[PDB]
Amino acid sequence: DLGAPQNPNAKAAGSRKIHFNWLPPSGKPMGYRVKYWIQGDSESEAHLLDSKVPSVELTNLYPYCDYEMKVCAYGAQGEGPYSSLVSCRTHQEVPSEPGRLAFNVVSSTVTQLSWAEPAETNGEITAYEVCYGLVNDDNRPIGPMKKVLVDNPKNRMLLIENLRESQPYRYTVKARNGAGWGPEREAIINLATQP
Amino acid sequence: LGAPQNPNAKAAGSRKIHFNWLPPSGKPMGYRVKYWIQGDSESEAHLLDSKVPSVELTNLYPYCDYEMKVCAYGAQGEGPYSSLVSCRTHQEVPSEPGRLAFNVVSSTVTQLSWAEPAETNGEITAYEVCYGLVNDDNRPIGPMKKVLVDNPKNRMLLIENLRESQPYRYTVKARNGAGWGPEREAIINLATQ
Numbered sequence: 001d002l003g004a005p006q007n008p009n010a011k012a013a014g015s016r017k018i019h020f021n022w023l024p025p026s027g028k029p030m031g032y033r034v035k036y037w038i039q040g041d042s043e044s045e046a047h048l049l050d051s052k053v054p055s056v057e058l059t060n061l062y063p064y065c066d067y068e069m070k071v072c073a074y075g076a077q078g079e080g081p082y083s084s085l086v087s088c089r090t091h092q093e094v095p096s097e098p099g100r101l102a103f104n105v106v107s108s109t110v111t112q113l114s115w116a117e118p119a120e121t122n123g124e125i126t127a128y129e130v131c132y133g134l135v136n137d138d139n140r141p142i143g144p145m146k147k148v149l150v151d152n153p154k155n156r157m158l159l160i161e162n163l164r165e166s167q168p169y170r171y172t173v174k175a176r177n178g179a180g181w182g183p184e185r186e187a188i189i190n191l192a193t194q195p
Numbered sequence: 196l197g198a199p200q201n202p203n204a205k206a207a208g209s210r211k212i213h214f215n216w217l218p219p220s221g222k223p224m225g226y227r228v229k230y231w232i233q234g235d236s237e238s239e240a241h242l243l244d245s246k247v248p249s250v251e252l253t254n255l256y257p258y259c260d261y262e263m264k265v266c267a268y269g270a271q272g273e274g275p276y277s278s279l280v281s282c283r284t285h286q287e288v289p290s291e292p293g294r295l296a297f298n299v300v301s302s303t304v305t306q307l308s309w310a311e312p313a314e315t316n317g318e319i320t321a322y323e324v325c326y327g328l329v330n331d332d333n334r335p336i337g338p339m340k341k342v343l344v345d346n347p348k349n350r351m352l353l354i355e356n357l358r359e360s361q362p363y364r365y366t367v368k369a370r371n372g373a374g375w376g377p378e379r380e381a382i383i384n385l386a387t388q
């Protein structure tokens with residue numbers, strides 16, 4: 001009957017998706033059935049898609065994730081054999097917010113700021129940026145921000161000194177990966193009113 | 196420092212929104228954008244910083260309404276926020292329907308049902324049921340019968356004239372504005388269900 005689709009080819013295309021194409025098999029295929037799954041998963045966790053043309057876009061995938069996939073053809077007699085297996089990884093996406101900020105009071109003018117890695121890295125985190133400045137009683141910034149680039153992603157703690165005694169400050173931490181910077185995690189803190 | 200004016204959002208690509216505005220009056224050093232899923236507390240808002248009067252909101256939910264606003268910050272701190280703008284993300288194909296449920300009626304008849312996809316990712320307008328004979332290896336061995344369901348609310352179908360004691364593969368998939376999603380499958384033989 002129908003032969004196996006030939007030259008299966010895949011490539012990341014856009015956000016959370018993969019363009020998977022192949023060469024129609026000898027004979028008269030009426031369509032194609034694609035099976036794909038996260039690399040490492042049992043085919044029991046595979047997803048099934050149909051297509052009338054020799055290509056298909058796999059969507060709603062996880063970012064920076066490895067996928068495996070194969071395709072077979074079907075016609076009047078039934079389904080033919082599956083093509084060989086191809087693998088492909090999805091593009092990165094900016095990380096989510098870092099974990100909630102934690103503060104240790106070293107003195108009336110110094111604090112240690114720490115944070116957990118974002119719940120969703122969506123890639124490989126290469127840095128963090130800490131920003132902070134004075135805010136009024138309504139928590140509104142009233143002066144320029146101070147920014148510190150953290151080059152070592154494992155160093156999720158920063159000592160901040162020379163802070164104005166008994167004044168509230170707004171602190172934020174944002175993370176970067178291959179796709180760029182993500183949203184910021186925020187906290188309003190006054191070292192004088194901390195436990 | 197004034198408030199950025201003429202803010203406007205536009206769905207741009209998958210799970211994304213292009214939000215832009217006009218630089219305010221004064222000397223803005225950058226901008227803070229606040230956005231959240233419409234209907235949720237601003238307490239659930241996400242915060243982005245940008246040096247240019249434009250930003251790409253990503254990792255959003257498909258077919259979801261979002262509200263947003265932006266402010267500029269400078270030597271004296273933050274200026275007031277812009278007016279609020281709303282925008283809805285594009286649709287994505289639905290996930291697969293719920294696991295297929297069969298209630299055998301006769302040796303040649305069965306009722307088939309399924310739940311709505313966990314992730315509709317849009318407004319489902321139809322489902323397609325497909326079924327046919329399979330061999331020992333669960334490989335389709337013949338023609339595939341197809342029933343189009345135009346009313347998304349009718350997620351139950353009565354199937355008749357099935358060959359006695361023969362295994363069949365059943366699949367159901369959903370369609371919304373973005374197209375057809377993946378299919379939910381099941382191989383069943385009424386003689387041994």
Ligand SMILES: C[As](C)(=O)[O-]
Nearest residue numbers: 134143162163164
């Ligand atoms: C370092 As300062 C601008 O709080 O004097």
Ligand SMILES: C[As](C)(=O)[O-]
Nearest residue numbers: 328338356357358
């Ligand atoms: C309705 As038949 C093709 O199983 O005889």
